[PDB]
């Protein structure tokens, strides 16, 4: 009879409980205290204008209907008690295809404190949208957002809040970085009020500041382009009595410029504007073509 008391506590706790009604439905506003622990900042896809993130998402609020009194002061319950109580319906405003992991059991955490405070934690992978401006590609810096709030509960019903100081709420782990191409500089949280066709909602925004690393595009594209330009400029030191030599020089370096440019266009998305690499490739191609026409003139 050591676990019968806890079964009685849990049964009495949910006896007369409506999980369709938020705490304080016509009496108060539900204040949800949010916290995010980023366990890994996943890869940022530039062709889809998206990024991946893996988070422990914690939400705390206070339900006066879940007050108890027993031999324990905190009930660390399963992930099936959360489906029998009211939990907030947080969604990600700019999410594409997120996953809430349930291996091997639903990765959810529910803790009820004897005064009625609940801590509800989830482990989930979010695939969010990051609208990028690629004018300065590949020397660009972005602020990838992550906006969340409540679906269907307006500002007069559910308001969000950070559990600690806003500069210390969204916490990224140190070894948690799956970034190959970027560099996570810092985080930046924000709070606002969005307005949609159903009312005004509270939105908690997080910005992750990324700075692309250039060391790949340098060796891949910028150094072959400069090498091809130098190899085209080599031709100016050959004697004009040998026309096929300089002819095959010019035309074959133009062909290589074409090969590098075609190879080079698979890196970036199909943006309609010119990036910085596009300007560099255009000027280098112009130099190669100018060298060849100069040979034609001589």
């Amino acid at each position, epitope marked *: 009879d050591n676990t019968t008391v806890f079964t009685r506590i849990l049964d009495r706790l949910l006896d007369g409980y409506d999980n369709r009604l938020r705490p304080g439905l016509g009496e108060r506003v539900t204040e949800v205290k949010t916290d995010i622990f980023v366990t890994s900042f996943g890869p940022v896809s530039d062709h889809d204008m998206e990024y991946t993130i893996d988070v422990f998402f914690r939400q705390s609020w206070k339900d006066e209907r879940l007050k108890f009194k027993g031999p324990m002061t905190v009930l660390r319950l399963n992930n099936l008690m959360a489906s029998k109580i009211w939990t907030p319906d947080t969604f990600f405003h700019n999410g594409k295809k997120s996953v809430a992991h349930n291996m091997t059991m639903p990765n959810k955490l529910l803790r009820i404190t004897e005064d009625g405070t609940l801590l509800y934690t989830m482990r989930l992978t979010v695939r969010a949208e990051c609208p990028m401006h690629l004018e300065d590609f590949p020397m660009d810096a972005h602020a990838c957002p992550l906006k969340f709030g409540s679906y269907a509960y307006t500002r007069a019903e559910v308001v969000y809040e950070w559990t600690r100081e806003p*500069a210390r709420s969204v916490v990224v782990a140190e070894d948690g970085s799956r970034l190959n191409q970027y560099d996570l500089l810092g985080q930046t949280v924000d709070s606002g009020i969005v307005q949609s066709s159903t009312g005004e909602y509270v939105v908690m925004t997080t910005h992750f500041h990324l700075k692309r690393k250039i060391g790949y595009f340098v060796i891949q594209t910028y150094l072959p382009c400069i090498m091809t330009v130098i190899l085209s400029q080599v031709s100016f030191w050959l004697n004009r009595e040998s026309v096929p030599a300089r002819t095959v020089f010019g035309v074959t370096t133009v062909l290589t410029m074409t090969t590098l440019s075609i190879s080079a266009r698979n890196s970036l998305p199909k943006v309609a504007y010119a990036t910085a690499m596009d300007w560099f490739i255009a000027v280098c191609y112009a130099f190669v073509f100018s060298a060849l026409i100069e040979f034609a003139t001589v």
Partner: antibody, heavy 116, light 105 residues
Framework: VQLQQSGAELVKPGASVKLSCTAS????????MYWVKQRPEQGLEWIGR????????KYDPKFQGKATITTDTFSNTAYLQLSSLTSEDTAVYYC???????????WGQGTSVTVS | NIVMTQSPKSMSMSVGERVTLSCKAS??????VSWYQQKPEQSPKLLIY???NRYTGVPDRFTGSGSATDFTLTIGSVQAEDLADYHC????????FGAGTKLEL
């Protein structure tokens, strides 16, 4: 809804004082509790922060090691203990409650601490 | 430690006109800047929270305008009881206040 602080008093240079702040109308285990210090005709300066539900505290680097904030949830009170006092501690100390987008909406009445 | 620089330190004006106070941050504080009003020998009272959010019990003549670094409090059609000290304080990190701004008639 209401924060009740203690009464003004004097203290000898080099002693220690313990100021109290009794809350009525809410539970201190729900919000954070801030201690703010104001000098005569100067700006406010934040001393420290306590989370009464968990118990962890933070302090301003200027007040780190000099002040110690503690709480008592039974009597719904928050305490600020100052040690190794000096003459530049003559100020008015406020006890504030966090709430509504980190704003410190509810303040106390302020206690005048004078060092003679 | 985020520093808040408020400007100006003092302002003399008559009754009824529009007045504007400015506050600047060293680091980023994203709409977590509160505006308090403190009368002499009293405790500060919250006027504006967030960056533009009137506290429940404040008149409509106070309005806040926010950014990432530059914040301002504008009072249109001031009255005879709006003379006090005004502090801007950030809450994005551990809270730090500004130097203050006396407002006299």
């Amino acid at each position: 809804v209401q924060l009740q602080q203690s009464g003004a008093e004097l203290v000898k240079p080099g002693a220690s004082v313990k100021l109290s702040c009794t809350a009525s109308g809410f539970n201190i285990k729900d919000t954070y509790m801030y201690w703010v210090k104001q000098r005569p005709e100067q700006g406010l300066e934040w001393i420290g922060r306590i989370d009464p539900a968990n118990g962890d505290t933070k302090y301003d680097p200027k007040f780190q090691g000099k002040a110690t904030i503690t709480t008592d949830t039974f009597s719904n009170t928050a305490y600020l203990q100052l040690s190794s006092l000096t003459s530049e501690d003559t100020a008015v100390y406020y006890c504030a409650r966090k709430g509504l987008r980190w704003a410190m909406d509810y303040w106390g009445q302020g206690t005048s601490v004078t060092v003679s | 430690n985020i520093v808040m620089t408020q400007s100006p330190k003092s302002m003399s004006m008559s009754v009824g006109e529009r007045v504007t106070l400015s506050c600047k941050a060293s680091e980023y504080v994203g709409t977590y800047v509160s505006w308090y009003q403190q009368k002499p020998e009293q405790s500060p009272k919250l006027l504006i929270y967030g960056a533009s959010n009137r506290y429940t019990g404040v008149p409509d003549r106070f309005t806040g305008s926010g950014s990432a670094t530059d914040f301002t409090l504008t009072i249109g059609s001031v009255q005879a009881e709006d003379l006090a000290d005004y502090h801007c304080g950030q809450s994005y990190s551990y809270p730090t206040f500004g130097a203050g701004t006396k407002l006299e008639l």
